[PDB]
Write a structure and sequence with these properties.
Chain lengths: 319, 319, 319, 319, 319, 319
């Protein structure tokens, strides 16, 4: 009676019944900005990735928007790192600047700024360290200061990736109090402590990791906890919720989709990306086929948005 | 705390989180075929809709596929009508000849053929009429022959729209018995007796409708019964299932998609088509906007394939 | 074993098993009031629709109630439009007046008043515009002022159709503070930005649309968002929740029914209405069959109340 | 109030509430067998992965079981290839001889045998090719013989990876017909057409792939179809069901486990394996960490058995 | 078609498909401390159980941690009992002391302290008694005082087993106010009034029971109530929720697992433990087989943590 | 706001809302029958449990029914054991003779007979042993004969406890084939391989257990498999389904009752019985309290019928 192959006999039928499709509007492009003028830097562990100066960031975004890309995620590489990470909320920082410069040249691009104290502190953690402890409530306080500054600079969205407890609520409360109740918040709800963040550390020249971040980042073994985390975030006001990493966490994505009916974002981390790059370089796989497909999978798992370093290459492929 | 508008502030943002999009691969074009050579007649009640001769129809398909449209729904309009409606399964019928020519000229186009005795009988009914009674099992025996015949000519798919009991099963058996287990079946699982069918009858030269098809077509007040019908056909072997009509039956489509894990199809019926045509002709509505939008709504509801007379105008727009 | 047609063999059985029925109590009649005396105006894009003077509004309602209709929805057409739309909360406005006049003559009719700043502002939006921005929190403030005035005038219900964030809560808070905790609130929970609102603009002589309302009105592609919207509204205190438009959004209606167990309303917008009018005028469909049936569909989708310009014609048909 | 971090403050706490752990009893080791005596060849695209002769393979198994690994997946690589692929069911085939020797040397090791015509045919396909068509029912008839043959040699389990329609059923019948109702069946229920299979083909000396297996292998965009496929096989008699590939299809695995109450299996495909190999060789990722972690993710998703080329390196690590 | 035994034919397969496993990290070891130096006491009704002096408690924990055990549960046996049970929050009590001494010697062990006024009051109840009434809100007040002291002493977690209403919220509020918002709370959510607590009374030399505790402890007949209880606790801030007793309450454990997605703990009470001890002493059962298995059952029911007096013997068995 | 204790303040209140109660109609009494006349032997490992001769057994039943107990589970203990275990279906077997005498003396007592080859074979197994293999289909053929034989003697019910594949089906067919469609079937759907069975073996003079029954009895770590097993038997025709053992498998019982809408039965196994016996004999536990309570827990979990050796002591207590 049943012969599933009937729906595969031809590309037409296959084309007709396909449950999911990937589109440019599903892509968000991370951007690493640095101090200086007229300069871009190839990232060693991330072939194809780059550190941009602001003036070069603007140049890129201009190409981005023209290719279809709808938003990016700004990472700020400060010249100096401190223990109190106060540079985060300096309105004259590279990040704030880039925010300003970009919003002006390509105003129709959704700028999303990264919120975390890793690139600004000398211990490799996303929060303030005291006596070996990543201080929770104290870190949010800076995170708040930080976020408000991004808004002041013209940030469209903020994306706290800190995994500190109850930071989405505090941050949202601050944005409201400074007339920024319209700036969205994309929160890293289910960010796990993963061995996939390798190539990224070197990308922004972040201080030595110095002890895992497993005191706030999630245990990769855990699922139920992801539901606990997301829910708390939505209740706090998160406009969108994200899972990180992505490729090997598609079950966490599907689950968030089925339960919360809020937009769901996912991160194609440096490792999954750098991994396909290295295998292709040896001729063991197809860069194009593998990259795109793995994006399809993220779409089939329920993701709506996808932070991917392949974002620009995928937009040309869909052009 | 919450502010849904935050996801609407900007085209970018709006483009990123949009839950559904419409694509060319969602569209199936109804093609009306008539006897004769090199000719075309617009349908009075369906502006921009025409009947084609085989020659003209083959060329049209060429333009169809070129635009990306993946499939067509072949509708036959025999020269003579009979009470036993035997022409339906004639190897030289105008329909059959269309199947043969099309598959040859445009092999890559998935050809779905309509299966029903409506255009082949004088009573304007989808089945055989005895004494004011539209016979079920008798009618099905003529449908089988029809389906095989269509398969014998090169059909890729048949779409029984009769609403006879146990017709999907019988047909699936006949098709397999004649070495056509590769030929799928698209079942009008839930076809209601609607007043949304007006303009269509003239399209094919209908016949003394005589009474009404409410003894086999479903009452538009019922939803549960639609779940019974579909489950019955899926159990029978239907590869795909369709709801008819479409615009005003999106709740049935959402229910279908939500429960049966099989491809779901909807029908942008003639009455829906003409209605935009008319309103637009008065300047009360924007034809292109309402048409495309109404297609979107069908995607939002859970439809994978859309049988629409606007198929060609959408493929361009989607181009 | 199974033969679904057994339940369709006769009108008796069909009559017995029918899942849903439409009744007069499912209908609500919109009423467009204007300044002046003894005068009614045919609406160009809405054949059968009219602008009534108060004295003629009262005359109509008297006929309405006698035909069975249980409530109407008052729209107020001011003589002058301002940027601050302060006329909305003028207790001497046409709307308030009509409220008073009607409540007196036909006190047993549930008056529902429209809350929005579109007919009162010169930019064609339902809220206050500043620098191209439809101001959210500022608009509610007027909406509150407005609502309280409707209550003071004797309004039974208020129906904010503004789609501003968190207006149901604010409005409800105001009604309570002014001894109007008994006045209900029918909120347009899931109001989409649609191409179906065509003929309505001209109806009330509303200022040129001047840019879509997609910054607050919902993306027609979205469903999950509709659940997010409704829930927020119910939590805020909405007595009833409505979806708009209706005909092509029946999946949004069914979904709200199954999830929230609060009364569910729907809108038969000008487009769906004007659409059946134009098609019938060409003889392409049956005005009666199409109008009523599409109302049946709304009932089968789960709607309890139905704002329809056919309300009066449907009540005669059910008389 | 809430503070998820409270469960992360300490290794103890973290160890207590961890939802999932990975064990040696989750692992199944793919073994590639080739003709000849005392020899071994590493796979170019799969570092640390080798082909074995029967003698070398028996010894390897000894080391396997000693490490706790409970099962193996025997892969055959015949000397000569044919179009009817008859060698597949030859009692003296290199595969069969491996089954016989292994069960004798290490009886306590559960031997699962691969069932597909890929290594036995020149077209590099899993079924019989007629005229560019991969035959289903014909191919299945050769699979049955294959399965019985394997059972006749002492196989404990067969794992049809062909993706032919109704193959589990046919095989289960053949096996029972020859007194092998004790021989289970591990079905590749949902095997997609992925670009994650690159390195594997060379492992066995693949053949003119010619076209693509997207007429029987599933489209990576679909999830619903995966539920259809599995349910079909469980209904057929499959003792266990597998998803392929693995890392990027964890949503399919969670869905499977969540709905079918039968043992679920996943595949750490070659492309996934090599990808860590490559990245690690560059020093971008920690090979041991990513490998083990990715295995964990598969446990978190709902996988019970893992076919992984890292099986031996995990058993040690888990030791 | 189906033969479940296929998955049991061998230990390998059995080993592969096993749904659940018990691990050291699933075990928590209760510890009874008493005043004095260099001394341990065999518990009469709990063969293998002991009362430890602090210096001997430290000695045990040192062995515990080395065997794998990740946390213990401290019970404090005061020399004097009062009616106001003020000794509970004496920072110089045996309990506080033991807390201090243990944290120092084996700092990497998760200390969990018991919160209740039974060992500190002369009426055998877990709260303050007035006129035959176990005072609810007054008892929490002490419970708060108590908890804060445990935190001050260095307690990792507190485990209120009092079954007083709304004590998890109050206690959590106190810990926060005294800079202990990082100390977790394992609450006895569903603690029933059971005949299984026999041997435990004598263990800590608790005052005569003097009337059941059925005025706060749960009716063993009740299930729905357990859902009511847990939910209230989670909403109050409980990090983990526990059911007590365990062996004959596995349905209450499974239910809490499926509903709340918070970590779930269970208690192997003195009775279930002392029961297996007595039956084995007569040669009527296997101490080892019965003890371990019943722990497996608790794991299969959904428990994550298990307070068991066999904890040390089970850790050797898993070593 | 909330205070669950409000429902515990008083015996009245507690008695009113109690979710479950235990009744005499929940109890089924296992009866062990042996050859000979007028004699009785207490079981060493089951104090208060005895074996009866037919005469003594008939009288016991008289006392049973008088106390309200509605049913019994007849256990046979043949004089001689054989490898083909043919005595099982001997019309003059000690079991059969018991059936005949009982039904005559106490017709109103529902007689359920045990169906398994354990007491009838020397290998102490429930099926036929060939070469260290417990044969399934062969064993079932002997079970059928057994069941019919029992029905032929006047049995009201048979309770296959063998855990053979497809035995319920075969037996149900045999029973119907011999005009016994009125004879129900109580299936040990989910009987685990537990160490809770110690005392029972001696009760019947077990035999060289030789190995273990883990090739047909279920692994105590699994729950999903229990759902597979039950559904399989219900599909086969089992009137009722049982879980074994009981106390420590209440999660399986709740799951059963929750999903299958068929009567559910549990088994207070020997190891559970003796365990209270022993602890009570030491004065560590109150035997009457723990016994009755543990029965309650079984009612709370969803059990309708309880096979317990405490049946008679409960009927009195419940009297
Ligand atoms: Mg969080
Ligand atoms: Mg039907
Ligand atoms: Mg809203
Ligand atoms: Mg399949
Ligand atoms: Mg409580
Ligand atoms: Mg079974």
């Amino acid at each position: 009676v049943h012969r599933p192959r009937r729906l595969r006999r031809t590309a037409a039928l296959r084309n007709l019944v396909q449950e999911n499709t990937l589109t440019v509007n599903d892509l968000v492009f991370p951007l690493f900005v640095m101090p200086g003028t007229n300069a871009v830097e190839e990232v060693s562990s991330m072939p194809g990735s780059f550190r941009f100066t602001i003036d070069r960031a603007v140049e890129e975004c201009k190409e981005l928007y023209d290719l279809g890309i709808q938003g990016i995620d700004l990472f700020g590489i400060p010249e100096q790192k401190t223990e109190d990470g106060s540079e985060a909320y300096n309105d004259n920082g590279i990040l704030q600047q880039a925010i300003r410069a970009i919003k002006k040249a390509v105003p129709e691009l959704c700028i999303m700024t990264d919120v975390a104290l890793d690139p600004f502190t000398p211990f490799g953690h996303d929060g303030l360290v005291k006596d070996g402890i990543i201080l929770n409530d104290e870190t949010v306080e800076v995170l708040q200061k930080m976020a408000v500054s991004h808004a002041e600079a013209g940030a469209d969205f903020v994306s706290p990736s800190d995994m500190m407890d109850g930071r989405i609520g505090a941050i949202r409360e601050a944005l409201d109090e400074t007339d920024h109740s319209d700036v969205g918040i994309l929160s890293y709800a289910a960010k796990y402590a993963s061995s996939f963040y390798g190539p990224f550390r070197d990308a922004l020249h972040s201080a030595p990791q110095f002890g895992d971040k497993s005191t706030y980042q999630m245990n990769p073994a855990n699922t139920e906890e992801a539901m606990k985390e997301v829910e708390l975030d939505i209740v706090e006001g998160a406009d969108i919720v994200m899972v990180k990493p992505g490729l090997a966490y598609l079950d966490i994505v599907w689950r968030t989709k089925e339960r919360f009916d809020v937009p769901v974002a996912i991160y194609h981390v440096s490792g999954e990306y750098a991994m396909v790059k290295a295998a292709a370089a040896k001729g063991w796989i197809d860069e194009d086929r593998v990259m795109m497909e793995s994006l399809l999978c993220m779409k089939r798992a329920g993701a709506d948005i996808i932070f991917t370093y392949y974002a620009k290459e995928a937009a040309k492929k869909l052009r």
